[PDB]
Amino acid sequence: AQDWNGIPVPANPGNGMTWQLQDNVSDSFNYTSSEGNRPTAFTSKWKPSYINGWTGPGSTIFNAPQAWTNGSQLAIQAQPAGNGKSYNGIITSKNKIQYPVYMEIKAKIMDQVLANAFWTLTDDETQEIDIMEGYGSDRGGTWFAQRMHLSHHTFIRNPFTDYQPMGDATWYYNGGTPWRSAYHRYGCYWKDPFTLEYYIDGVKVRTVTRAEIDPNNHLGGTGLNQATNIIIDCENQTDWRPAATQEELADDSKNIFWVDWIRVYKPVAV
């Protein structure tokens, strides 16, 4: 039994193909775990830290105790750190994925000004896909509470230059309903280095084609081709957002990004 059994994959696997689950990056999180008490069902697939020693952007402090599971769901939690900062949960995959691949979570974002995201990043930190990035609280602006960011980045490193698409379709609106108010399925078909498709609740909402992938050639013509790491996290992005208050961070009814499951598939021959 897995939590998603019976729910179709919304993308087409191709002529004479079928979708096959990638076991080592899929999980129903149907076990109890925490710092000092992590079973093989978790540790064989996930680590409660970033892909390297960085502690995160702005007023973020990535911290292992803030990722845990409750018998049915993954909790990505925030806590007060004092002096204007937070402690922040994060998990990353121990195994990589690569196109062609369909990847999807079922999740409910926090009622906080903090970012909550499901994304990929390569070891060299040059290629990033943002399957979803949400900001749940009305205190950050109702405009943001009511929209889901769907994006990707290409970077030059050392020295640093960032590219992401900036079109209005990168922020998806659901009739005014805040994203904090329910669980949704957030999915992406990374079909090839120049093609991304985004799906919410099984419905295709956005396609990214070649001209929007890397128009400045930060990647030297490869597109989004490299094998990469999966990340699920929360962040206090004070480089551009208002800081979370310490009281908001202490409120255990508002400070958890809940993930019921993650599933990943690849197309294979029948």
Binding flag, residue 69, Ca ion (CB under 5 A): no
CA distance 61 to 233: 11
Instruction: Indicate which of Na ion, Ca ion, none lies near residue 141 (CB less than 5 to 8 Å, by partner kind).
Output: Na ion
- Among residues 35, 104, 128, 247, the one annotated as catalytic is 128
CA distance 267 to 78: 37
State which amino acid sits at residue 152: H
Instruction: Indicate which of Ca ion, Na ion, none lies near residue 198 (CB less than 5 to 8 Å, by partner kind).
Output: none
Among 11, 25, 27, 28, binds Ca ion (CB under 5 A): 28
Say if CB 67 and CB 76 are below 8 A apart: yes
Instruction: Indicate which of Na ion, Ca ion, none lies near residue 125 (CB less than 5 to 8 Å, by partner kind).
Output: none
Binding flag, residue 142, Na ion (CB under 5 A): yes
Active site residue 104: no
When computed from its CA atoms, the radius of gyration of the chain, rounded to whole angstroms, is: 18
Binding flag, residue 260, Ca ion (CB under 5 A): yes
Binding flag, residue 140, Na ion (CB under 5 A): no
Contact letters for Na ion, residues 95-134 (x by CB under 5 A): ----------------------------------------
Tell me if residue 260 falls in helix, strand or coil: strand
Burial of 109-139, coded b for 16+ CB within 10 Å and e otherwise, reads bbbbbbbbbbbbbbeeebbbbbbbbbbbbeb
- Chain residues in the site for Na ion (CB under 5 A): 141-142
